[PDB]
Design a protein around this ligand. Structure first.
Ligand code: NA
Lengths: 286, 8, 287
């Protein structure tokens, strides 16, 4: 049913129609409405981004280290699970989570959320392995954090909607833009930001992607950014959400993973192509 | 298989 | 319960006694006898060690890699769990297990048991994390491999006994010797042994321990071996078992973890101190 998505608001199974978790199918068999107040994707509606107002990036998580503070970001899937990048794991002494906050300073000084387990993808390739066995560094850059206690959702705190491989492949990833955010550096080698920043980044064609860098992105990644416009994710933004909007709902489509520097001419950010890891995510959320 | 390494 | 161990054969708590899994409390209330043929800790009864005959180290697992061969070892906790070191995880392309064999060449080429999941302690401190944060490298060097299908037990394939923290603390580590084995290299930077080697090494006192090391010996590890006597574990032995005998029964007490060279004067081998990771093990095992 790749004909305008069967005129259906969310997922289309060839036609059969459905919706994201916490959504309800209309009487017309096409529409999807919010089942509750904490339904995923719902909103208030980095180099050279904007200050994401409180309640505008509700799914934004902050990974917090005792001595280094916020080093990475994550994405809330449910009250128990937070999505992040593998390379953000075991690269620091301690790792806590903080949500519903946009101030970098207040997050590091305030109360933290305890982490229980952390699922790192078994095929993840760190710089270490990529040099030893000639693999692609940051391939399978994905990981899931399992909190000790359920997260309290609210206006400022809610999860991003997990899409179906199809929906994400045939609709979302065919969109013009994605949104991404984090507390990372405001410029290559520059200082980390004082507040959460949010950025729109256009989808780049896989070709213009292989042509741009010495480092080719694998089939499990995708790139996004600008040719000459100084807008990109940067160090410290890893794990952050790359979401795509569809019918005023936010679906998680990527993860901030890597890139040659930050906001360089003819180069783009690299993202964990999340549509490749949907069943992987679904298994662990069971 | 969950294709994962768990950190407890 | 520190004077005679409450007279218990294994575990005591004030007093009441009890035994390790697969053992029954004697008719006296203090004894412990094997209540089955595959009970843990039952045996046929590395630099400068002796060949561990078949069935002498049944709990000895072998971590195997296509290109690297047997890079590490482990200890059988149960039919579907194997204890090893965290630093043996993610250092080779592939990884699978082999139990019941003592011949290196036969293990490599032979068939292989498949690995399902793998638990690594969250506070494990890899060398790189150590330097960056000035933490003790190889702290919390513990991991558990979960097999996809249960391991078939026999008189050559059986698990080592898991002690109580208290028991492992007051009785086990207060013993004189401990057994270490592996397919590791037989000489610092030397060749890998063609056979499963086994070795006895004495517990060394905390102080003598820390003071003789170039790097910190945290409360989560302990050292063993000899001052000048050239016996010790070595590379490739990581994850290998360190057990203590107590009444014809072997308990797991350590895990080959780290060391400055192999069998060097005035220096010892470092081991993960299991008495610190009993709850960590129990949690996983019980699921
Ligand atoms: Na650019």
């Amino acid at each position: 049913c790749r004909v305008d998505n069967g005129n259906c608001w969310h997922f289309c199974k060839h036609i059969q129609c459905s919706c994201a978790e916490g959504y309800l199918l209309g009487e017309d068999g096409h529409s999807c409405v919010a089942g509750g107040n904490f339904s995923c994707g719902r909103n208030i509606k980095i180099v050279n981004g904007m200050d994401c107002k409180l309640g505008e990036c509700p799914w934004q998580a902050a990974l917090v280290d005792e001595k280094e503070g916020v080093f990475c970001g994550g994405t809330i899937l449910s009250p128990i699970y937070v999505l992040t990048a593998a390379h953000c794991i075991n690269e620091t002494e301690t790792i806590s989570v903080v949500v519903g906050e946009i101030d970098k300073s207040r997050i590091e000084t305030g109360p933290l959320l305890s982490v229980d387990k952390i699922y790192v993808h078994k095929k993840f390739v760190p710089p270490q392995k990529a040099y030893k066995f000639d693999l692609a560094a940051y391939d399978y850059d994905i990981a899931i954090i399992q909190m000790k206690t359920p997260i309290q959702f609210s206006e400022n705190v809610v999860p991003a909607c997990l899409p179906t491989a199809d929906f994400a492949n045939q609709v979302l990833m065919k969109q013009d833009f994605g949104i991404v955010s984090g507390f990372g550096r405001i410029v290559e080698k520059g200082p980390k930001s004082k507040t959460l920043k949010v950025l729109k980044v256009p989808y780049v064609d896989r070709h213009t992607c292989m042509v741009s860098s010495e480092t080719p992105i694998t089939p499990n990644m995708f790139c996004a950014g600008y040719d000459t416009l100084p807008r990109d994710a940067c160090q410290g933004d890893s794990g952050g959400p790359h979401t795509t909007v569809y019918r005023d709902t936010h679906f998680i489509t990527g993860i901030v993973s890597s890139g040659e520097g930050c906001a360089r001419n003819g180069k783009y950010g690299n993202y964990t192509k999340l549509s490749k890891f949907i069943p992987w995510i679904k298994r662990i959320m069971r | 298989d969950i294709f994962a390494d768990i950190f407890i």
